[PDB]
Structures are given as C-alpha cells and as structure tokens.
Design a protein around this ligand. Structure first.
Ligand SMILES: CC(=O)SCCNC(=O)CCNC(=O)[C@H](O)C(C)(C)COP(=O)(O)OP(=O)(O)OC[C@H]1O[C@@H](n2cnc3c(N)ncnc32)[C@H](O)[C@@H]1OP(=O)(O)O
Ligand SMILES: CC(=O)SCCNC(=O)CCNC(=O)[C@H](O)C(C)(C)COP(=O)(O)OP(=O)(O)OC[C@H]1O[C@@H](n2cnc3c(N)ncnc32)[C@H](O)[C@@H]1OP(=O)(O)O
Ligand SMILES: CC(=O)SCCNC(=O)CCNC(=O)[C@H](O)C(C)(C)COP(=O)(O)OP(=O)(O)OC[C@H]1O[C@@H](n2cnc3c(N)ncnc32)[C@H](O)[C@@H]1OP(=O)(O)O
Ligand SMILES: [Cl-]
Ligand SMILES: [Cl-]
Ligand SMILES: [Cl-]
Ligand SMILES: [Cl-]
Ligand SMILES: [Cl-]
Ligand SMILES: [Cl-]
Ligand SMILES: [Cl-]
Ligand SMILES: [Cl-]
Ligand SMILES: [Cl-]
Ligand SMILES: [Cl-]
Ligand SMILES: [Cl-]
Ligand SMILES: [Cl-]
Ligand SMILES: [K+]
Ligand SMILES: [K+]
Ligand SMILES: [K+]
Ligand SMILES: [K+]
Ligand SMILES: [K+]
Ligand SMILES: [K+]
Ligand SMILES: [K+]
Ligand SMILES: [K+]
Ligand SMILES: [K+]
Ligand SMILES: [Mg+2]
Ligand SMILES: [Mg+2]
Ligand SMILES: [Mg+2]
Lengths: 376, 376, 376
C-alpha cells in the first residue's frame, strides 16, 4: 500500500544528546547522508535512542532539522515517538509530540512520511495508536491515511496480534490500512519473553522473525529485523542479514552509518561469480572467537554504568569489555531492562526460598547476595 | 476422516506435454507404476507441471487416462486443478475443469478420490473452493462430501488460516470436513514471503513445516512436505525426509519415479541394526560439496531460459549448472516467480533511490543495470 | 497473577507404586527434600507417573502425605490429576479425585496451591477444567480462584489455544485467571504430532517451546519445558536448559532428585568468570557419543517390555540399551504411545497397499511382518 515496496535499512538517530555543543548534531549529520550511505528509512528516535529528560528537546530538534533539511533527504523519514501498551501517560506523550511535529506552520510535516510506534500490545492497542494518527491528520488538515504507521513488534502480545491483521485492518472503524513496516525489536522482546543467555548477548529468535515476515506478507506490510547491537562485528551483521533474507525479512535496523552501508549492499545480488567448495585485524577474527560470560557481579556493574550514562543525558552508548581485545555493544534502556532477568530470577528465588538462603550464600558470598537483592 | 491415515508420497505428473508423440505420455506411464514404485497419492497436475496453453488438453488427458487406467492404480488419485486466491478467472477455470473431469458418463470420477487446490489464501478463500466441490458433487449426483479436498499451503495467509480450521470446519454453512491433505508448497511460498538465498536454492522453512504439521494434527488432516527440487540429490532428499519426520510431517512431494521409491521407503523402520558412533560417483559427493552463487546476470539468464521452455509447451524442466560436474534443479513457473525477488528488489531500489544510480552503475556496469530494469 | 514469578523446577513423583512396602514411599521422600534439592513446584503425579490400577490408591496417598508433611514442604504443591480432551470419563475421574483431595476435613487442601491438568485441547476444553475447579472451590468453601490451574501443552490443539488466551481469560463466564503454568509435554506431543526419529529419542520441538514461552508472556503465565527423559545425561540436560532459557522458558520438568538439583542451579548466574575461546567416566562421554537405531523388531520389544511393567503396577521405569555401556531412558505410557508411530505407519501401509506386500516381505521377512500387524 505504500511507495516503498522494499526497505533495506531502517536507521535510528538520537534526537537530542546532552553535554552539548548542538543537541541536534546527530540528526543534522544523518540528514546529510547520501547514496549508499543514506538509509531507505531514516528514523529520528525520540524513544530509546534518547534520554528521557531529553525528549521534549528531542521533539523540537525533530521539527527544526526536518524543517531545514528534510526536503532533499533522499530516503523516507518516519520518526519514532514514545508509546507503551501498559502506560496511558506514555501513549498520551507520544500523541502530543506527533501533534507538535506535524503542525504544518512549522514546515516539518511535508517531509515526514509517517511515524514509528514502539511497545504495541494486542490489536486493540494498535487501534489506539491508529486513532491518534487519525486525530493528528484531521487536526492539521492532512489527508486521512497519509501518515504511515510502522510498529515495533517487541512483545509476545504484539507477535500474536499479527495473526489476524488482514481482517482487523478491513474494519471500517479504523484506518489501519496506514500500516507500513512491522519491525522486530529483539531487545525489548528478550525482556518481555524473560529470555537469558550465558553471555548476555541477544538470542537469535528465528521464530519471531519468521512470524513477522509471515505477518507482513499476509497483511501487505514490509518486515524489518531489529538491531544488531554488536555494532563493530561486520561479519556477524552480514551473516544475520543473509539468515533474515532466507526468511523473507529483507530489511534490517542500522545503528551506525557503517551499518547503513553494509545493510544497503547486502541484499543486492552480486556483480559476478562464483563457485564455492564446502569441504572444510587479527583482533577482528579474535573477537569473532572470544566471548565473556559475566558473573552476577558483572551484570550489576553493566547496569549501574548504563544507569549513570542515561542519567547524564545519553540514551545510547557503546559499552566495552576489555581483555588480555575490545568488544563493543550498543546499550540503551532496553538493554538494561533485558540484562536484569538473571537478577530478577535470583531475587524471586531468594524471596521465596528461605530454605536455599544458605547454599546461595555459599555459592555467591553474603556480600554479592545483598548487592543483588538491592537492584531495581 | 479419510481412508489413508498416512501418506508417504504425493507424486505429481504433467497432464499434457508439447512437442508430442502422445501429450498424455507422462500420465500413462505414472498410471502403470506398482509396488514401491507407486505413490500413496498420485497427482495429475494441471497447474504448475503443465504449460498454460496446454491445460485444456491436459484436463481431457486426465479424463482419458484415468478412464482407461485408474481402475487398478493402486494408490489414490487426486488431480491438481488451477486456483488462485487473488484471481477470480483462475478459480472459475479450476472449477470448470473439475466439473468436466467428474462427469460420470466419462468414466473417470469413479477412480478419483478428490482434487488438490493450489494457492489458497485465508479461510474464506478455502470456503470458496469448498463450495465448488459441493456444486460439482450435486451437479453430477455424487454423494455430498465424497470428493476429498487437499490444499497447497504456499502463502503467508494460508499458513495463518490453518490456526482456526477445527472450528471453521464445524460450521454447517460449509462442507470443509472433506479436507484431506495440507501440503506445503515451498516454491510459491518463497515467492510470497519474498525470501532469497545466495545460491537461489529454496530456504528450508522449518517453521512452515512445523505449522503445517500442527495444523493437520489439530484439524484431523495429514501434513505433506513440498517439492525437493534438486531431483538428483538422493542424500539431500533423505536428510530432508528425516528432518520432516521429526516434525510429524511424514509425507513428502515426489517429482520423479526415483523420488517415489526413496520417499516410500524412508519412513519405514529398518530391517535391523544398528549402533552409531558420533565422534567425527566422486561426482556425487562433489555436487554434495559445491554450490554456485549466481550474479545478477546469471539470474536473468535462468529466467529467460525457463520463459522460452514454458512458451514452447513445457511446464517443468531440469535446468543445469555445469563446471570444471552437472547440478540439476527442477524449474517451473513458481521457480521463475521465486527467482525474480533479487531483481524486484534491485528495481525498487533503482526507481526510488536516484541518489544511488551512480554507485549501482559502478557496482554492476550500465549495461547489466539496463538489462535488470527490463525484466517482467 | 500468582506468588511465584519464576519456576525453575517442576518435579513429578509417582503417587502409588505396586510391589509394595509403602506405596506412598516416593511421595514421603520427595516431601522431605530441602534447599537446592527441593523443587520450586512439586507435582504428585496421579497421571502418567502412576499405573492406572493404582490411581485410586494414589489419590488417597496424596491426601495422606500432604496432610502429614505438606506444612513445611518449602516449594509449592500442585498435584497432577487425570484429564483428556477426548474422554469424558477421564475428565470426570480427574474432577472426582480433585474433589476428594480438597475436602478440608482431610487436612491436605491447606497445603495445595493448585492442580496440573494434562491432555487439554482447544480453549473450550480448558474452560471445562476451569469449571470443575470452580465447582470444587464452592463445594468445599475455598475462596473462588484460590486453586491455581496449570496445564500441560501436549497436543496441536492446545498449542494453538495459547494464541487467544488473554481475551478468553477476560470473559466473565470463566475463572481462567487461575491459570499459572503452561508446561510442555514433549512425549505425548510427539505422539499427537505423529513425529518419529531414527533413534526413538524425542524431537527437540523448538517451535513448541517458542510458542509456549510466547503464550505465557502474552497471558501472564509462566512457561516450563517438558521432561528430559535421558535422566542420566547430565550434560544434555544442561544444554537443553540453556537452549530453553534463550527462548524465555526458564523452568524445566525434573524426573529425579538429581535433575532437581541441576535444574535449580542452571539458570542462576555464575559466581565469577569467565572468558571463552571458540576456535576448536569415559563411559559418560561414550554414551554422549553413541546412539542406537532400533529395527522394527526392537520397537515392538521396548513396547511389550513397558506394557508388562505397567500391568505389574509400575507407571514409570528406566529402560536400558546395553552394548560392547548402558543407556537409560525414562519410559511411561506416553513413551509407549509415541514409540508406536513407525508401527502404525507400517500397518496403514500394509492394509492399504496390497501391491507392496511382497517387497515388504522381502524387506522384513514374513515373520517380522505378521508380528507388526499384531501390535495394539
Ligand atoms: C532497541 C533499540 O531501541 S535500538 C535503537 C536505539 N539506539 C540507537 O539508535 C543507537 C544509535 N547509535 C548511536 O547512538 C551510536 O552509533 C553509538 C553510541 C551506539 C556508537 O557511537 P560511535 O562509536 O560514534 O559509532 P561510529 O564510530 O560508527 O560513528 C561514526 C560517526 O557517525 C556518527 N553516528 C554514529 N551513529 C549515528 C546515528 N545513529 N545517527 C547519526 N549519526 C551517528 C558518530 O557520532 C560518528 O560521528 P563523528 O563524525 O563526530 O565521529
Ligand atoms: C512447485 C511445484 O508446482 S512442483 C510440481 C510441479 N512440477 C512437476 O511435477 C515436475 C514433474 N517432474 C518432471 O516434469 C520431470 O521429472 C523432470 C522434467 C523434472 C525431470 O525429467 P527426467 O530428467 O526424465 O527425470 P528422470 O530421469 O527421473 O525420469 C525417469 C523416467 O520417468 C519419467 N518421468 C519423470 N518424471 C515423471 C513424472 N513426474 N510423471 C511421470 N513420469 C515421469 C521420465 O520421463 C523418464 O521417462 P523415460 O522412461 O521415457 O526416460
Ligand atoms: C511424560 C510424562 O508424563 S513424564 C512424568 C511422568 N514420569 C515420572 O514422573 C517418572 C518419575 N521418576 C521415576 O519414576 C524414577 O526417577 C525413575 C523410575 C525414572 C528412575 O528411578 P531411579 O533409577 O531410582 O532414579 P535415581 O537413581 O535418581 O533415584 C534416586 C533416589 O531417589 C528416588 N526417586 C527417584 N525419582 C523420584 C521421584 N520422581 N520422586 C520421588 N523420589 C524419587 C529413587 O527411588 C532413589 O531412591 P532410594 O533412595 O530408595 O534409592
Ligand atoms: Cl515522543
Ligand atoms: Cl493501559
Ligand atoms: Cl490481539
Ligand atoms: Cl516483507
Ligand atoms: Cl485446471
Ligand atoms: Cl479475488
Ligand atoms: Cl484466515
Ligand atoms: Cl499428519
Ligand atoms: Cl486423578
Ligand atoms: Cl469428548
Ligand atoms: Cl482453541
Ligand atoms: Cl515465562
Ligand atoms: K476508516
Ligand atoms: K480500516
Ligand atoms: K516477508
Ligand atoms: K454442510
Ligand atoms: K462443515
Ligand atoms: K502431524
Ligand atoms: K468468573
Ligand atoms: K475470566
Ligand atoms: K516467557
Ligand atoms: Mg524496544
Ligand atoms: Mg506452487
Ligand atoms: Mg503427557
């Protein structure tokens, strides 16, 4: 239903960073990208890319930058607003921001193709965002249905909601034919699913990607994968994109300008070639070969470190494990929430298993224990 | 609900081939197969096995061969008609053909257990085919419900439609208790899902096979896997069948008489044996080890080559990649449609990304570019 | 909605074993377990752990043991009753047993947090168990909703029923807000799905575990994996738990006191550590490396052996394959039902393929054939 039949790259940029020369600096730069460096879909991100205390200034920055530069951005612009299925205050905040951003007197809306809504739940929560899009349109004299809605699938409920989208979109009490991208959010989804891994890295969730690809094909939407947060792992990003393309998920989230270029080229067929034989800078194949398996103490450390960064006005940071090499991973509030699971489980167990207090004290030490019991 | 509780082999045969001694030659031969050589379910295929210009003659051939030989065919006969969820002309054509085929004056219908319907969409499209079966029955005085319907699951919508089949089949406004096999169609499904792989070979779609197996168990149907189009790869076909059987999908499509024999034997338990130790004709293990990774140019070539074969009256052909060995893959219209994805994406990108025209010209050459922009 | 936010271990114990000093012996012992040895959820099992002729005595044993010992059991107690979606007699039996067990005069109900229902089908079969819980509550003056219901997902229909649980639980004609655990039952599920493997071991069913984890997250329930029946394979159990935790399924069934300890420790984060490098008692790594691939004859043997054990008053047994090592697997009625698939398929084929009788006689011998044709 939308102009872009295929979307290779979905790139988010923080809308307002603190410390500050120009808080809009990341948007002004991403707005000047061109050719293979520029994304099919660019997402100024007022949600997890942006510290909370910074989001009001972020939405002004969005209006200001797209005002001045959006006219020749060559991809499509769809900013991410705040939303959450379980928070009416957050829904209202994302609606008020969209309403400000599309005021036609401000010159941004003419260059905005739609908005991206995170944390949606079942289909009746998607109809609530849809109704806000309709109200915004009517309040600002835009054509009905002209702002595309894209959603981030980052809960069990939203994953199930993709099952009946075709007939729910047909109901004439909604305008959900405006739906454009269905985008996985593996980080908050890991959180919602309560998953954990020995390294703390994201599970691969092949079934989620299968279901988001199916859902888009059945409903006329386009499926995009979520963030590959080991931002320096060029080879990993390529292998993930190839795995995605075999599920029919041909687009991927990009966190950096370097990911944009890789993800723009990856699904393009090759120049020539090429026969393969399948019988059977050192730093880079070394990081490819090492992993760390953090202790309960390590986990709390990563969280406090992130906590401090966010409180200082930074939404997203590259966090580092160093040895012997230097392993980098993009952290934000989602990453923080997801990392907490092994701790929430420990706490549940301590609270409810007084008979195990002694072995847990043997296993951790009474000091590590009392620290864990403090978090969140 | 049907006589065959288990179906190992679902074998399709083209119903009318051009060039021509006897256009029915493939059906007359498949109709004489016996023992391990004969399939549990034999499908004379008026759809993708058969060139379009040939399908009217194909449906006559179906009546003629089953008339003369169907009496002692030892498996069940279920011919595939044309259908498509998005084409009313195609639905009507498949219904008119079924109506001709079951005319009891012609002596074919007494040896036909049902029909196979390709390209179904959501459950309301399955009810449309069901209604045609009911009309055919009544028009020709067959008992209501006596023709089995089997469907090919080869879209995202049909995959989702298997979720509520039990209660939709119970509604008394339909006769969908006639449902027999739910059969995956990986080739058109790859197309519908927009998937792609570096070699052009089919993705494995484990979740599709999981869901078709689940759907059959929940609704009282029997699940069958789709075609394994590397028809000479005996070892690959065996490994796929073993992988299927572990999902509860115990039947598989067969494209050749040699696949019939393999697929008839594979799920039978062994004669004796057998302990395995898991610590760690040359041409055949060589093809097992090589793959080709085609260029944008290669892709267009395979398509034009197929295009020409179909236009000459051949629906299915073995296409060949040669090196140094000879790699064979069954091609039909589905294969053609599926192969086009990397091209449709390139075209989308060229059309919508004028700012990338220059790097794409560097990457391919202006000649390769203008060729790609021509396809389909 | 329930006190335990996380459940690591779900341990079943037979409620009545024949031969007999004290038929309650397994319950009395499991009831004395403490610390890391004691499960978060303990399941006295009146269903597949217990021979049928023994289940009336089993439900008395349940009342007697929990009466005397349940007060200081430190985990939660949820006994498994009999049930089946396709047997009204079995539903009624499980309800009469729950009604006996919760009589407040008998002193067991004060220490029971809920009951576990096996073999559920679609959501309307779950509402039938729910209604029995409500009747039991009212008949015995318990607070409405105070007995938790947990279900075992061990059919295709129940797997699909998890898709709409959130809104079905909201209907005020039911009390399904009492739902607590959604627990996979891989053994009966293998049966229901008709799956088979060359060794007879359980398929891994990653999608089932994905869907049960999703279903629990969407509906506010807790997801637990099914039994790991190679009870001596410590390393296998650990790898399965790690694979589960990456799907968000953080609990697992335990069949032995040794599994309880392993599964209690596995999802706890580590004491310290630990960097890994990924470039590349003998009996135990030997069993880790061998497998057996049974013949049609072998399969019947395992079944008759199990059949005899059950008829003698034993519900669960460790069955043994010996060579050269000793491979142990927990067998019960589910295992028996699941093992029969390769035989049911052979029988279907023999019955319906008279033209294959001769090759099947060549392949097996007329004696092996006539034996297979006798089973069940
Ligand atoms: C689950 C979720 O919600 S994920 C989506 C939310 N998170 C995000 O969007 C994170 C976005 N990305 C970022 O914030 C940054 O890339 C970081 C912090 C992760 C990494 O920072 P760096 O180490 O600078 O990355 P890198 O070295 O590739 O940067 C290259 C240049 O492009 C700039 N750049 C990096 N990422 C972006 C971006 N997302 N948008 C605009 N400009 C960017 C960098 O600032 C750097 O600028 P310079 O020219 O002043 O040096
Ligand atoms: C996604 C989909 O729609 S797939 C289902 C649609 N496609 C089909 O059904 C394709 C069916 N198969 C075929 O058309 C052919 O097998 C081909 C063209 C792919 C390969 O042809 P060949 O290379 O002959 O295969 P093969 O060497 O195994 O053939 C053995 C003999 O059996 C015949 N035979 C092969 N396939 C079939 C068939 N499907 N039905 C009847 N007879 C067949 C061959 O013609 C050959 O005959 P001969 O005795 O005159 O030599
Ligand atoms: C698909 C399904 O329905 S699966 C769930 C149904 N099946 C079951 O629950 C099977 C439960 N487990 C058992 O019956 C037994 O563990 C068996 C028969 C499989 C194995 O028996 P063993 O070889 O004794 O196991 P193991 O050596 O670990 O036993 C250690 C001790 O704990 C006891 N024990 C073992 N399992 C249990 C149990 N499930 N509950 C209580 N006590 C147990 C043993 O009897 C043994 O006792 P001892 O002190 O007298 O020697
Ligand atoms: Cl916002
Ligand atoms: Cl709310
Ligand atoms: Cl929903
Ligand atoms: Cl898509
Ligand atoms: Cl037809
Ligand atoms: Cl139509
Ligand atoms: Cl549907
Ligand atoms: Cl089946
Ligand atoms: Cl019972
Ligand atoms: Cl019933
Ligand atoms: Cl249901
Ligand atoms: Cl859970
Ligand atoms: K409308
Ligand atoms: K609508
Ligand atoms: K898709
Ligand atoms: K009817
Ligand atoms: K019906
Ligand atoms: K099945
Ligand atoms: K109620
Ligand atoms: K309710
Ligand atoms: K979960
Ligand atoms: Mg998120
Ligand atoms: Mg097809
Ligand atoms: Mg069971």
């Amino acid at each position: 239903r939308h102009d872009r039949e295929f979307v290779r790259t979905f790139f988010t940029s923080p809308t307002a960073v603190e410390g500050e020369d120009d808080s809009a600096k990341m948007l002004r730069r991403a707005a000047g990208l061109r050719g293979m460096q520029a994304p099919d879909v660019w997402v100024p991100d007022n949600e997890d890319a942006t510290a909370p205390s910074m989001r009001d200034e972020g939405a002004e920055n969005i209006v200001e930058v797209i005002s001045e530069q959006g006219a020749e951005f060559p991809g499509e612009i769809h900013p991410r607003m705040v939303w959450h299925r379980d928070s009416p205050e957050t829904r209202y905040q994302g609606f008020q921001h969209m309403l400000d951003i599309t005021d036609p007197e401000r010159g941004a809306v003419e260059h905005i193709h739609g908005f991206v809504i995170p944390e949606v739940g079942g289909i009746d929560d998607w109809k609530k965002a849809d109704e806000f899009f309709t109200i915004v349109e009517h309040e600002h004299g835009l054509d009905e249905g002209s702002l595309a809605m894209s959603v981030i699938i980052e809960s069990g409920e939203a994953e199930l909601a993709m099952g009946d989208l075709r007939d729910e979109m047909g109901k004439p009490t909604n305008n959900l034919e405006r739906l454009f991208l269905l985008v996985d959010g593996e980080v908050d989804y890991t959180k919602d699913m309560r998953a954990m891994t020995p390294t703390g890295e994201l599970p691969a969730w092949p079934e989620l990607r299968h279901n988001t690809s199916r859902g888009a094909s059945a409903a006329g939407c386009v499926a995009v994968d979520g963030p590959y947060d080991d931002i320096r792992d060029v080879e990993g990003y390529r292998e993930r994109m190839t795995d995605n393309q075999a599920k029919g998920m041909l687009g991927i989230w990009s966190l950096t300008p370097g990911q944009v270029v890789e993800a723009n080229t990856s699904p393009l067929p090759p120049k020539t070639g090429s026969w393969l034989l399948d019988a059977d800078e050192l730093r880079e194949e070394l990081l490819g070969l090492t992993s760390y398996v953090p202790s309960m103490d390590d986990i709390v450390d990563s969280m406090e470190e992130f906590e401090a960064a966010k409180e200082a006005g930074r939404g997203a940071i590259a966090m580092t494990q160093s040895a012997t090499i230097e392993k980098d991973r993009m952290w934000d509030e989602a990453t923080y929430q997801a990392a907490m699971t092994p701790i929430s489980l420990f706490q549940d167990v301590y609270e409810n298993r007084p008979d195990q207090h002694e072995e847990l004290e043997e296993r951790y030490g009474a000091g590590v224990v009392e620290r864990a019991m403090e978090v969140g």
